[PDB]
Amino acid sequence: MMSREADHTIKGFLYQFNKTLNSILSSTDQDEIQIEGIIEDIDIKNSNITNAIQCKYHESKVRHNLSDIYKPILQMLLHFLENDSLNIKYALYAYFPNEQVGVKEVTKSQIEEILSSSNFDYISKYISKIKPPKEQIIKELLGKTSKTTEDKTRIKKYYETSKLETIVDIDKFLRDHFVFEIGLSYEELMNETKNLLMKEGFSLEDVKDLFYPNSIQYIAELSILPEAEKRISSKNKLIDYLKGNKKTAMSRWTSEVLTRKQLLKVRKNQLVPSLNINSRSRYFIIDPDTIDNFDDEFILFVKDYLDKYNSKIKLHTETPCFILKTDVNNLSEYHKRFVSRNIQIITGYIGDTFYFKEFNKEPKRIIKDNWVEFKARISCNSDEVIKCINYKKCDDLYIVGGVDVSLLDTADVNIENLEINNFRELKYLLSMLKEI
């Protein structure tokens, strides 16, 4: 039994994608959108909030059968019970092949007859909180961890019979905090979206794989910035061209499963270049508390990276560097776990003192044998090691997880943000694992 909060988050994400794609379609001149703004978090310092709307629809029906929009509106009203400050502009989106397009007739009576619902799930979830019962027995029954058939029947009978009021201003929610427009199904509108995007030069599959997801994410990221005044937009064609440049600049950070398999195939087929070069300097920035089972799998991942990218004695002349995000300690245990596996690394730390010359030394190698002094550099996310990195720049820098890229100079360095969940995903992205 999965938690309903995850399902609500999934529905909110689907609405966010739908609204973002609608804004992209309507982005012609001076849109100034405020896509979404609630992620069910603690701080709401800057509102920048559209709503936590959902887009649900059944297979095919002229009219809604029964209790279709009951759960979304119940969640909307429950959330509105703790909504204040600036106005939050609620709405509701749906598709119907044969129905009116636009605002539906919703003034007062529809919600009163929705509030007359008698579903056990709805009563246990939102009706009880919206309309508290007037009996202590019902209050005790609702708070019980386990509910029996007799208790559920009694609660249903009490709710259906007894007229229970509420303290939330329902008419205020109706006049302003709700819009119900029947839109179009954006699954079939993917072709139209591609056709509208197919107005510049671009390419056939490039729009499908690189341009459309990048536009969707960049537009969706317009409202996540801490500044609330960054949404100023005018002449949407000019900002569309700017996003056209930005998509080629980034070419990453795709959200959905578009063209992408397993858990995250996102990227790849564009990381293969600069991974087919022998003498290249690749630096990895890893946040340990973002990868599942980091402690027991980092050593194996390092071993399998070095047996592919640091095997050749004459062509592989650059040493990989793995700057983790931990304390100065916890490096001794990694060093111990590498020694037991017969892998030679250097940390640059003797105890707690960092040594500039011990971290910038080049490994002496002997070609008649197959000996290199050390095969990797593994240190922490400290200031001295960042100064070392800036002193000897890399050609590619891979950011795994969320790590502050500041204090790192980026003259001729290619930043490649990689979001992953486990080491199988990272292995698959680096062309060292054919399958998942």
Can you give the binding site for another protein, defined by CB under 8 A?
272, 275-279, 308-309, 312-315, 317, 431
Sequence-separated contacts (24+) of 130-139 with Cβ below 8 Å? 130/74, 130/77, 130/78, 130/81, 130/166, 130/168, 131/164, 131/165, 131/166, 132/164, 132/166, 133/158, 133/159, 133/162, 133/164, 134/162, 134/164, 135/162
Q: Interface with a second copy includes 287 (CB under 8 A)? A: no
Q: Pick between residue 329 and residue 370 the one whose CB is nearest to another protein.
A: 370
CB of 377 to another protein, least distance (A): 20
The reply to whether 356 sits near a second copy by the rule CB under 8 A is no
Region binding a second copy by CB under 8 A among candidate stretches 96-104, 110-118, 290-298, 349-357? 349-357
384 contacts a second copy (rule: CB under 8 A): no
Report what 364 binds from another protein, a second copy, none; CB cut-off 5-8 Å by kind.
Answer: a second copy
CB under 5 to 8 A by kind: which of another protein, a second copy, none does 369 bind? a second copy
The interface partner of residue 431, options being another protein, a second copy, none and the CB cut-off 5 to 8 Å by kind, is another protein
Q: Which is nearer to a second copy, 64 or 335 (CB)?
A: 335
Which partner in a second copy, another protein, none is near 281 (CB below 5 to 8 A by kind)? Answer: none
> What gap in Å lies between CA 337 and CA 313, rounded to an integer?
24
Structure token pair of residue 61: 């029906």
What is the C-alpha to C-alpha distance for residues 370 and 220, in angstroms, rounded to an integer? 51
Least Å from the CB of residue 300 to a second copy? 19
Q: For another protein, give the closer residue by CB, 78 or 432.
A: 432
Q: Please state, in angstroms and rounded to a whole number, the distance separating the CA atoms of residues 109 and 111.
A: 5
Task: Work out what residue 277 binds among another protein, a second copy, none; the CB cut-off runs from 5 to 8 Å by kind.
Answer: another protein
Q: How far is the CB of 195 from another protein (least distance, A)?
A: 30
Beta-ladder partners of 323:
285, 379
By C-beta, is 204 or 350 nearer to a second copy?
350
Beta carbon of residue 312, minimum distance to another protein (angstroms, whole number): 7
The correct pick among 355, 363, 382, 433 for binding a second copy (CB under 8 A) is: 355
Which span sits near a second copy by CB under 8 A: 199-207, 213-221, 335-343, 398-406?
335-343
Region of 97-105, 161-169, 362-370, 419-427 interacting with a second copy (CB under 8 A): 362-370
Under rule CB under 8 A, residue 373 binds a second copy: yes
How far apart CA 111 and CA 130 sit, in angstroms, is 13
Please give the size of the binding site for a second copy, defined by CB under 8 A: 15
Look at residue 278 and give the partner it binds from another protein, a second copy, none, a contact being a CB closer than 5 to 8 Å depending on partner kind: another protein
d(CA 421, CA 203) in angstroms, rounded, equals 31
Return all residues near 20 (Cβ < 8 A) that are at least 6 apart.
35, 36, 216, 219, 220
- 144 lies in the site for a second copy, by CB under 8 A: no
Binding span for a second copy by CB under 8 A among 39-47, 121-129, 329-337, 411-419: 329-337
Q: Which of another protein, a second copy, none does residue 351 bind (CB under 5 to 8 Å by kind)?
A: a second copy
| Residue 125 makes contact with a second copy by CB under 8 A | no
**Residue 351 contacts by C-beta under 8 Å, 6 or more apart in sequence?**
none
Q: Is 241 in the site for a second copy (CB under 8 A)?
A: no
- Identify which of residues 287 and 358 has a Cβ nearer to a second copy in the complex: 358
User: Nearest approach, Cβ of 335 to a second copy (angstroms)?
Assistant: 5
- 282 has which bridge partners? 396
Binding-site member from 28, 353, 410, 414 for a second copy (CB under 8 A): 353
- Taking the least distance from each CB to a second copy, the nearer of 369 and 435 is 369
Least Å distance, CB 363 to a second copy, is 11
Among 335, 343, 390, 395, binds a second copy (CB under 8 A): 335
CB 141 within 8 A of CB 147: yes
Write the single-letter amino acid at 117: S
Give the footprint of a second copy on this chain (CB under 8 A).
332-333, 335-336, 339, 350-351, 353, 355, 358, 364, 366, 369, 371, 373
